[PDB]
Design a protein around this nucleic acid. Structure first.
Ligand SMILES: C[C@@H]1CCO[C@H]2Cn3cc(C(=O)NCc4ccc(F)cc4F)c(=O)c(O)c3C(=O)N12
Ligand SMILES: C[C@@H]1CCO[C@H]2Cn3cc(C(=O)NCc4ccc(F)cc4F)c(=O)c(O)c3C(=O)N12
Ligand SMILES: [Mg+2]
Ligand SMILES: [Mg+2]
Ligand SMILES: [Mg+2]
Ligand SMILES: [Mg+2]
Ligand SMILES: [Zn+2]
Ligand SMILES: [Zn+2]
Lengths: 47, 66, 261, 237, 261, 47, 237, 66
DNA sequence: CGGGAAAATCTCTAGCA
DNA sequence: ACTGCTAGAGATTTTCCCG
DNA sequence: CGGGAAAATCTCTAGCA
DNA sequence: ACTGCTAGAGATTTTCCCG
């Protein structure tokens, strides 16, 4: 599996780790505490 | 018949990009067009490009100018 | 490095040293220090340095609202060509956006629209307008203008042209239409050295012509190709290479180890 | 290159246009245009009344593609705004009008002057009738008449299909404008190359037609001749 | 092209077409259309696309003020090394800035400071402090943070480290000092794989050593070189090339056509 | 001589033409109506 | 490489340190350190009273470089803040103190724990006297005592010059810290290379000294020998 | 005497940039140092760099490591 | 001289507000 | 007459290591 | 085949707010 | 399951043109 740390929306604080669900070119779909978020790959780090 | 149609298909020029390259590449020659993918010929190299990453034109400047 | 690793993790809990510092100060291999950094949640504060690429299909239009002189300007761009369509509207209301999008659909073959998550673009009236005209709504990731960078740069260009030609008109709407005209037909460049209008006409005509020609070719040219597999469909052959489509997966294989039936 | 004699014979026999020869015998369009030599901007403007509101309708004559919207009043300002929009969206060169009060106002004339449109004072009536028919068909799906008018424009432009090849008005106007762009491109190339004179083998001056990579195509005494780049010189006059 | 030029200038007064459009639409050469555009004041709306480079001498320090948690943080950076010095101050006042700069001058060899045009940095108290310590004030072009991009990026880095280590301290000033410590001694990278403190020590020691060594060399090595001219001073010779200084103009010439006396 | 068009300070409107006095790497000194201004070369065009 | 015997002879004759041999005979520092083998972090802290205000003075013992500022009160919080600042600006390893109330408080101990400083409880008195002299000299140029204290620190650190070579305290501390950085670099290199064993020509294991591009320097039976890369193998143990 | 001093001068490494190039170039060898200009040797090429565009270090890592 | 692995280098982005 | 930079995350290229 | 000039291409930045 | 771009200003490289 993977760990994702991200910067969701207008919040400069980084959040994580989240479960990586889908990895596309430019954006990733993640799950953070039963919440599905779509984050651009600029604002995310996958480990 | 078929050869004329193939020649017309190959008369179109395609501008395209790669997944990690942000600059548009030169006018490759169109070989095949599909719903989600186009087949091009760029400098003696055949590539398959997603339809969302390709701009297929003709260039009437060129056409009417050799 | 068991002793060195413990003294580096203990230091990282205090200083959050980067992998280079702990590698130097505790004789750790680079991979070990990188593992130490990567396991600290407090040091995950930077995303990867790349950019995505927007959809450039001929049917995609990017819409956005901009503000000038206290008014609201609704702007649409054809992504493949740069052809723009702008109009001053009384307010950022779903009714005005629905009307503008219905006009756009009635003027050009609009298949899908890519907008941000503004209230007007997410209204049920705009959804009903898109459903009637068969337009597929794609909404960007919230607070990510880079998803609609095309329409954002078009907003910049439109504002520059409006500033250029503001004196010739007395209202803002006349200047907006004048700027649309100037951008669409009086500015050349891009892929074909075209204007926006010439490029969009070329794009749509090319789509129609290529669709019809490929339909005729596929109707006439019917063959099955065996390579290395199953009866793959033949797409293009010649120049020592064959392009085939097996199980909706298009691959290019050389003429060798391939037979056309 | 080698097909110039064949193209001349084909033109003498069948009077084919330069498009056919360029598409068949693999010739540059300038050579074909010389051999054969040896509407897209037309719009009609009208005002139509429906349910007490004024609808300004613009039709592309060569294709039947319509541009209509409900205007608040039959005033030269509103129609000038409409025409400026139309010029900004399509290559409008001239508009046909019915000598109405809103079409001969000074504002509309100024709009035409700025947009480079010439004003000149049966298809429009049939187009208005068809638009009214479609509006009556789709009125029940819209609360306001302006939304219904745009629905009717969409339907007429992309859903109703007729003609020889069964294309819609949008496809027809796109094809027509593409053909006009090709025509303008060819005209610009002809104008660019017409200022040159060529001397070959040295013979008298010859009008230049094409400047190919491996040959130069020229015209001398109403006859087209192909000479190599290495046996001729081109000068500007 | 006399007729074409007039029809293009007349169109440009209306549309301000770019050079490509008028070159295409009026058969103009590219230079003529570019001249038409370049003579229109309304189309001069873009500067050249490059960047300058900040002074990187060992004596330059860049100062700036940043704000965090409602407090003011005065930050200084040594440009050559990245060594930073930060301190929470009660207010953006010329007294506090003068005190901070006097401290900085008393701690390190500060020869010149590069700041923006804030009120505290332009105060007469700061000027008097710089005069007493022999510090030369360089003020950036107004509203151009790129002139102090070094201290701006250092503000970003300091804020990131403060966010990392905020929980370990109860006040902001303690966390600021902790972040300064971490940046200066617990983060490696850069030119020598150094920390900021190691790099600044290396820079200052190298300056001193090179100055003394070059002074001794110039005292011992005294020659005049004639090339092609006057008695140019000899700076370095060898490997088929000679470096000379003629009339305060340093040039490199090959060993041929040069004689050392 | 030279013509300089520039964007001085927090004003998005471009101004000019001005007399070019000194051209350095990264910035230029100009004269616009007896007023001496120093503008970065990013925010200036010299003709 | 070839100068190893000369370096051994020089060490046997004059007992020179590895720095001199590495600077003279062109040897890597590890080889010289092996041949010769075959304070920078020290600070003193004190509190001084002047005109009813408390001045906290930190001196670098090996160089005489001072760090002083006026603190609002003689409290462990203030001196902990001062020491955290000092650690953030200079590589402070241990501080000497006089068992005062503000130096044995829990806050200062926590600051030392976080900053990696060891607390241990004549130069400081002379330094305080010199600081007082300079403060009295430059008091007339400052309204507040805190500004004058910083002026005195600046003067003592960079203007007053004395010693063998006539350098100031700032140059001395810079040189000392540079030397300490060199020492730490050499120690890290020694630790990195000490985990390897070399077999040459195959003979017994030999401690590795240098891994040059064209040769490998090793030690066998208290003797340094140079072998080619192509006649020896290096393994990690 | 003089040769030792020259060798020590050439033992220092310089990081520098050009007027239009924003990336710092590799550690060239220092030949001469002046008030406003330094003379370097980068890959068998001698250049003169303004003092404000050069970072002259030694690199104690390297020194104490060959 | 030849692959693999590790290291070095290059590319590229956000935030500084 | 003054001037974008820095540090980290991936991707790609060089170099080292044993054969 | 050789320079010069012109054209094409590449690089790089602000604004979109 | 989604995604920076665009147009202009300089600098550099290719190509064309007459020898
Ligand atoms: C009132 C003082 C004096 C007059 O001007 C203001 C406004 N200002 C604005 C920024 C700023 O825009 N930072 C973001 C940023 C953007 C681009 C870039 F290249 C570098 C950057 F840091 C500052 O940092 C800053 O210190 C000030 C300031 O101090 N003042
Ligand atoms: C309330 C709606 C919906 C929710 O979000 C807000 C805020 N917003 C912000 C920008 C903006 O930041 N433009 C500058 C920019 C910066 C970077 C870049 F890559 C592209 C850019 F255009 C917009 O353009 C925009 O349309 C909106 C908007 O519409 N809304
Ligand atoms: Mg928006
Ligand atoms: Mg926007
Ligand atoms: Mg500032
Ligand atoms: Mg700032
Ligand atoms: Zn950490
Ligand atoms: Zn203009």
């Amino acid at each position: 599996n993977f760990r994702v740390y991200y910067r969701d929306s207008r919040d400069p604080v980084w959040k994580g780790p989240a479960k990586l669900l889908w990895k596309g070119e430019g954006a990733v779909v993640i799950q953070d505490n039963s919440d599905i978020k779509v984050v651009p790959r600029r604002k995310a780090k996958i480990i | 018949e078929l050869q004329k149609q193939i020649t017309k298909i190959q008369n179109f020029r395609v501008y395209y990009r790669d997944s990690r390259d942000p600059v548009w590449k030169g006018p490759a020659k169109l070989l095949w067009k599909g719903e989600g993918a186009v087949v091009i010929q760029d400098n003696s190299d055949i590539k398959v490009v997603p339809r969302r990453k390709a701009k297929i034109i003709r260039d009437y400047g060129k056409q009417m100018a050799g | 490095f068991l002793d060195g690793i413990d003294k580096a993790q203990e230091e990282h809990e205090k200083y959050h040293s980067n992998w280079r510092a702990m590698a130097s100060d505790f004789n750790l291999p680079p991979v070990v220090a990188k593992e130490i950094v990567a396991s600290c949640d407090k040091c995950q504060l930077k995303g990867e340095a790349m950019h995505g690429q927007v959809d450039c299909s001929p049917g995609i239009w990017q819409l956005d609202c901009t503000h000038l002189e206290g008014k609201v300007i609704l702007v649409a761009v054809h992504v493949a060509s740069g052809y723009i369509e702008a109009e001053v509207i009384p307010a950022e209301t779903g009714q005005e956006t629905a009307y503008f999008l219905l006009k756009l659909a009635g003027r050009w073959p609009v298949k899908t629209v890519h907008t941000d998550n503004g209230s007007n673009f997410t209204s049920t009236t705009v959804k009903a307008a898109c459903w009637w005209a068969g337009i597929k709504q794609e909404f960007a990731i919230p607070y990510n203008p880079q998803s609609k960078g095309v329409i954002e740069s078009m907003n910049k260009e439109l504002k520059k042209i409006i500033g250029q030609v503001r004196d010739q008109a007395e209202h803002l709407k006349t200047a907006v239409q004048m700027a649309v005209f100037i951008h669409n037909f009086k500015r050349k460049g891009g892929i074909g050295g075209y204007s926006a209008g010439e490029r969009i006409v070329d794009i749509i005509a090319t789509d129609i012509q290529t669709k019809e020609l490929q339909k005729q070719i596929t109707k006439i040219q019917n063959f099955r190709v065996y390579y290395r597999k199953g009866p793959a469909k033949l797409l293009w052959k010649g120049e020592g290479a064959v392009v085939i489509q097996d199980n909706s997966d298009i691959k290019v294989v050389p003429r060798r180890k391939a037979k056309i039936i």
